[PDB]
Design a protein around this ligand. Structure first.
Ligand SMILES: [Ca+2]
Ligand SMILES: [Ca+2]
Ligand SMILES: [Ca+2]
Ligand SMILES: [Ca+2]
Ligand SMILES: [Ca+2]
Ligand SMILES: [Ca+2]
Lengths: 196, 213, 197, 197, 213, 196
């Protein structure tokens, strides 16, 4: 009784700066990207079978800056604040904001060989909290976490933390984008308008 | 013709390993049809499924649904105008359906004329079932719920928690049965029928009945 | 591979028995089959029906006189039947009592079926369709396109479902039942929803 | 692969016999099992108990009257037993003489065991737990979270160990023994310690 | 040496015919010895026998004792002065014994040194029993009680009735365990031990747990 | 009786300059990186099963500079002072401070093919002094070596010497970072607070 799809879409745009900057995204349908957010909402619950966040440049060999990515699973865990701390999470990965063009291969999902350079990490769907998570809206989750963070562990598998520094200027510079490549199992439909 | 409703004695067995297994049927809820749509919801958690189950299961810290079946049985005549609707929701936080339509989308949606579903009877009687095509009854998927083992929760304590934030519910209860009735003929409720739940639950980790919250 | 197969059964349309041979008709394409399917399918540029089944289901009393009729037209050019007489010739013609058909329920909840003779339900025969892969179309746009010339539609929609309601008992609508649609579809070539027309 | 399995046995908690049925209770999670385990495990975001065993071990004289009781609760919602009467119903209930249990030593030093009937020790049955992989939690944070509502805890900790001490001989504490914990854990998804809450 | 107390999971089985059979052991009561004699009594009725049984059996209108065994287990040292005494009474109206003597007359009288009875352990553990000669434990005769089937009664409702007139009890409860402790060394209670009850009860005619009085 | 883990973390940040600059790090848990330093301390001794130092850029194709790395094992051996000398140690390896983005693959430990370019070297755990080394704190080792260097041979397997030159400016420039990827066997636990 499952309907499963596989797809890649844009997840978020990246900017480099003079000082370090740590941000994070949840690894739940609603936030991964617009497309999925939309389709996934038509089913009550889901399960990740494969999730991959791939960084891809848009700047030039000339622009300085480095990106960093990792996964966290507690949610209550205080989000990293130093490249070092971040380098410790599962699936760490770092590179120059202009490197990673090799990861492209993952998004059009073809025949890949030279992926050494790829600035892309993958979620370990196997060691996740549970298998079936409820589809949640950023807004509703927000509220729950407003009460207490730990209320989130049963709503989301994990989150992707991102750090960006070693910038040329102390004022945002288009560096690249992060796209997500997933394979999700969706179950127990519902009118999209009812899902929270 | 019709038939007579006769419920069978509960079955309890101690499957060495800690598990005590109860299989039984109880009248879960009474139904009424009006001319305007009306949606109600029932938590598919031991405490609210049934009066007896409520008491029995209390003596066990946790449980696991093995087979849950809500069957609709009529109690009005073929002349009674009205339709019933049932479905399942899993994120207690999701909004409760409002149209016979939205409800038509949920897992195990089932619909029929208030005066039908009489075939489903065999589910409650525990007799050998015949043509269940006309039967109005749905079942929980079980194999796709958050956790396998859920904690016996009191309707009260549940509400208290769900009061802090509804999302705290997802880790306490598997799902809920959504029910809707419309296409009725009176602005004032008319005897529709009732929904009986036929379950089989595994109960573990014993605790004093009054220690359990 | 590339295909996102999904099989679901949702409410397609509510029905009202009357006494003036009334003919309606819905296109057999995503945007129109049902609300839910419309929602999801929009996220894909094209699709193909693997199995479509429109089933009628009562909600009235054992009396409430009335009959419901269903048929399929394939060339959007042909004129929608005006009389049940013509509707009866159509491919996959099915007629029945407004309160009968409770047996078809087995199609909706997916369970195994028993006796489906009393059931009021018909299906689209995917084999004799023009294209295999149709473009997802918003009825709103379809409309405009048909305004130019109906034939422009032939290549946009597999078929049309013609419904007929008569032999009732009231000058004004009387609630009779609904038509649920149980389909199996293959969706392809994703697109952001708002872009699909 | 990804898992960092570690099996160790360290002191979990020191015990004092008295004469006022005293009930304590520790969570069965890393941060609380013991000091050492707390230290290491923090470096990993989650974990799973493969085997947990709390064993009691004497340090007093062959007399020093006193009894020790151990049980496991699974829904942090349930009220901690107040009387040994309720503690005795619990899953994996174990009672014993404050100076008895010297036989359990075999569990701590890992050697092969002989007669474990005199030994005072119980184990968590990993099979009937809610999740498989729990989040590592600092009791300090757990606390706060439980302050909102205890149920928020259910998904953060496998179980709780309820201990009871009574039938002693002094109005004031008397040294009786310790409870060592022998566990086998699978640690996953590393994180810098200071970030784990 | 001693041993470790370990109680076994309850056993429940549905013996077609309406009977549900539960066999289990629970700590029934805690004991304290003083220098002056002190007699206490415990009703051998499901509600008071044990905390768990209390909850479980509530879901059944009637029951029947099949095997009731009160076993005394020590928790003090061989240096503790004191003796325990247990017996049975059947007419709740009869006066409660006052001398270690009168008590020596009742059915299944048993006596020992507060620090003994350790052998009786095997009764609670559910292990194969060895030398039970030294064991302090007695059993209800069962085959000679007023009725076979008794009504589940609430400690409260029982008392209310016994309040009108004690004799109204004979038709509500089978018997009561009489307990006495003396030969102690302090004018202030010292940890003696505790009495565990090991039963096997037949429960019939189900009822909502909260409907039962 | 061993507990063994495998992980990658940040070991140290790199800066390029107008003149040559030679620095060195010990290949002992405590110094490899924070994470390991922390966990490893809970065990009295350990053994390397695999140690790899990988350099990864963070600058731009435009920034000039070259990095150099090698291993030394005596400890008393006078640390190199010329690119040449360094080029002689085991596992030498050099490249442009902006090259090496291909080594990334080693850190997320995936499917690597195009690692020719990788600025990354590996320790020969096999020809090491002994197998089981004692966990040591930088501070305690420091003291011992204060007496005599040779006292170190029984405390540490080896050290990674690093040289950086051919810089654009005569004043530090963020070039990249060196991460360590290890697989260690830890034995004979101890309260972390006692290990020196
Ligand atoms: Ca939801
Ligand atoms: Ca509970
Ligand atoms: Ca389109
Ligand atoms: Ca944490
Ligand atoms: Ca009663
Ligand atoms: Ca050391």
């Amino acid at each position: 009784g499952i309907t499963v799809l596989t797809h890649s879409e844009l997840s978020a745009e990246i900017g480099v700066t003079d000082s370090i900057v740590v941000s994070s995204e949840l690894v739940m349908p609603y936030t991964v990207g617009t497309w999925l957010r939309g389709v996934a909402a038509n089913w009550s619950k889901y399960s990740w079978l494969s999730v991959r966040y791939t960084y891809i440049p848009s700047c030039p060999s000339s622009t300085a800056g480095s990106i960093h990515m990792g996964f966290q699973y507690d949610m209550a865990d205080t989000v990293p604040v130093s490249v070092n701390q971040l380098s410790n999470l599962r699936g760490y990965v770092s590179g120059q904001v202009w490197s990673g063009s090799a990861g492209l291969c993952f998004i059009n999902g073809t025949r890949c060989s030279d992926t050494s350079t790829a600035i892309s990490t993958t979620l370990d769907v196997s060691k996740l909290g549970k298998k079936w998570y409820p589809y949640k809206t950023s807004a509703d989750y927000a509220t729950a976490v407003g009460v207490d963070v730990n209320i989130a562990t049963p709503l989301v598998p994990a989150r992707l933390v991102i750090a960006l520094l070693d910038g040329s200027s102390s004022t945002a510079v288009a560096a690249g984008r992060i796209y997500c490549t997933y394979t999700i199992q969706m179950i127990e439909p519902t009118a999209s308008a009812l899902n929270n």
